[PDB]
Design a protein around this ligand. Sequence first.
Ligand SMILES: O=c1ccn([C@@H]2O[C@H](COP(=O)(O)OP(=O)(O)O[C@H]3O[C@H](CO)[C@@H](O)[C@H](O)[C@H]3O)[C@@H](O)[C@H]2O)c(=O)[nH]1
Ligand SMILES: [Ca+2]
Length: 272
Amino acid sequence: ADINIFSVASGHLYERMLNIMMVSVMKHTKHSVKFWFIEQFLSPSFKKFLPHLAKEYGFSYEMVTYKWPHWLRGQREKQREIWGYKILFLDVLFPLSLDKVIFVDADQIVRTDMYDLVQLDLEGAPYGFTPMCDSRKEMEGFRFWKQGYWKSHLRGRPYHISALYVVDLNRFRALAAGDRLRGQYHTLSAANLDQDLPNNMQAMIPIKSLPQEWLWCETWCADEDLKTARTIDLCNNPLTKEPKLDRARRQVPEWTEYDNEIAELAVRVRAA
Ligand SMILES: O=c1ccn([C@@H]2O[C@H](COP(=O)(O)OP(=O)(O)O[C@H]3O[C@H](CO)[C@@H](O)[C@H](O)[C@H]3O)[C@@H](O)[C@H]2O)c(=O)[nH]1
Ligand SMILES: [Ca+2]
């Protein structure tokens, strides 16, 4: 397919949002799209509905059955296991026939043609991530990456949010980035695994910083930049603690539209 998107998450609300993420992608492209999931992290109900969603919205999909290898230290906590599946297996989840894959968070709403991200020049980097926004200045106290360990360690590189990333799998494989990430994981495994690990290894495994418009989250990013945002992440706000759905329905007018459309499809599938 032209566009290849990977997502992984757990839970009922995240499955509901995952369907909305997929629909949002299809509403903004005419290029072909394949979604890649990890079989064990989708509920039976989700897996039964998926072929119906695919036929309605004109995408293909694959459920991968890759299991955490015995030689790699596991994670007892589900959230951390899922973070491992996001970042530790990019060279092994996907076949060598695949040139590129994009991780999109299940809570995202896309407002752009994702083929633009496929075509974006990564300047030799094995992957590209969006920097955390500086624009909402009133949240500076929560920008942990601008002080202490991160300020000195980054030596002027951005700290990037892990909600969205494009992986040039040819470059990633050539650099043995998967081995390098797993190697650092083993050393460090003796906080936010999916985000801290790639941000920590930029000197060895570089990140191309995507233009800021690629990922807007209200927590970090100014109101004025919503109108130009290509994708929205519903990232949590440590100040307000505003609930996830309230953020979704408040921030994103089309969220309800997509949710309703999918629900109506489910009603018809069940009626038949
Ligand atoms: O019901 C849930 C709740 C969370 N998660 C996952 O748990 C992590 C934390 O997510 P969440 O509590 O919703 O916070 P967010 O603020 O949306 O997460 C932001 O920060 C995380 C790193 O801390 C990144 O993984 C996300 O991409 C980024 O959007 C993420 O991997 C989620 O996908 C689930 O799978 N199911
Ligand atoms: Ca998110």
